């Protein structure tokens, strides 16, 4: 990296105001219908969101015992932004190592913990349940059949992207990106704090992002310096943040932090979801870093809208019977 991260954290120049500060009570389906979830949101308290989180003093070792010591986890090397893997016991050893004894700076942003003991300890904002394509569009008997708690693709029965645990030591940095498939993100700071830089997904900024990706100079060009308006904002302990489809963001961790968060597609910004998918296609992102079963899900969306509105099903008879059985439960 040739740019100076400390100057990007200190400058006052990222002074756009894109975020709406909302009360949880007001984040409801009517709000999504009216505004298309186009604006980043911060909830400084959780009242009215319907979230649930682990004990306030939950630790990385607690996360380990809930997902398993031997669970393989994807880790980022912050210096290179490249991936590596280790087990959760090895990650916990790293995270518990005093700061001055750690050789390298590593971040975990990708531990998806559905189908483990941790899953029932964390619930995301209720409103997300009403709009996520996984919950509302994917055939329910397939989602319910998932047993595997890792993200192994051969055992994945639906897009397994709903519930992630992020564990970040002080100094961690995640460089600018757009979340896979143009997913929207919810992010709850359980302990610690985060600094985000936000860039809006205008056509011009998405063209800059794609060219920056294709240039391979991400370590040299701090992308927030290339755009007309960027907002740097701090998220404190207890805040919940929702990032809309397409938003180009980078994240710095000023203190050891534990976050719970997750991704979702929804029906109110499909053009942006499709735009982001095509950027990933053109820039040759490996499938492992993409939303699983993306076009499969888009076909199930079309079928649900036609069925719900017109009562004409385009599912096979067997799939219709699987659904009818679940309606009678």
């Amino acid at each position: 990296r040739t740019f100076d991260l400390e100057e990007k954290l200190q400058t006052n120049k990222y002074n756009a105001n894109f975020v709406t500060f909302m009360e949880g009570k007001d984040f409801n389906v009517e709000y999504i219908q009216r505004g298309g979830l186009r604006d980043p949101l911060i909830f400084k308290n959780s009242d009215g969101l319907g979230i649930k989180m682990p004990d306030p003093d939950f630790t990385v070792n607690d996360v380990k015992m809930c997902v398993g010591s031997r669970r393989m986890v994807d880790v980022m090397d912050v210096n290179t932004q490249k991936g590596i893997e280790m087990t959760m016991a090895q990650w916990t050893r790293y995270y518990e190592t005093p700061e001055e004894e750690r050789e390298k700076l590593y971040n975990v942003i990708s531990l998806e913990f559905s189908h483990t003991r941790l899953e029932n300890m964390v619930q995301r904002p209720s409103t997300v349940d009403f709009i996520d394509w996984v919950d509302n569009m994917w055939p329910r008997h397939l989602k319910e059949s998932q047993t595997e708690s890792t993200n192994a693709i051969l055992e994945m029965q639906y897009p397994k992207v709903q519930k992630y645990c992020l564990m970040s030591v002080r100094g961690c940095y995640t460089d600018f990106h757009v979340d896979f498939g143009g997913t929207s993100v919810w992010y709850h700071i359980h302990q610690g704090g985060k600094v985000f830089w936000l860039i809006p997904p205008t056509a011009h900024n998405l063209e800059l992002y794609e060219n920056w990706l294709l240039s391979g100079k991400q370590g040299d060009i701090f992308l927030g310096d290339r755009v007309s308006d960027c907002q740097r904002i701090e998220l404190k302990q207890g805040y919940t943040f929702v990032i809309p489809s397409g938003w180009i963001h980078a994240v710095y961790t000023p203190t050891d932090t534990l976050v719970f968060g997750g991704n979702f597609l929804h029906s109110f910004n499909i053009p942006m979801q499709l735009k982001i998918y095509s950027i990933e296609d053109r820039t040759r992102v490996p499938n492992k870093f993409r939303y699983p079963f993306y076009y499969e899900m888009c076909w199930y969306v079309l079928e649900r809208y036609v069925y719900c509105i017109t009562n004409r099903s385009h599912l096979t008879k067997d799939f219709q019977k699987e659904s009818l059985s679940m309606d009678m439960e």
Binding site: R1, D74, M76, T80, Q81, K82, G83, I109, S110, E112, T150, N151, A152, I153, L154, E155, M156, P159, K160, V161, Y164, T174, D175, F176, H177, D179, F180, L213, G216, Q218, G219, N263, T283, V285, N287, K288, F289, R290, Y291, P292
Partner: peptide
């Protein structure tokens, strides 16, 4: 060596 999907990571430098 099983293939995975839904891994969150930006691009490497």
């Amino acid at each position: 060596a099983p293939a995975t999907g839904g891994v969150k990571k930006p691009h490497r430098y």
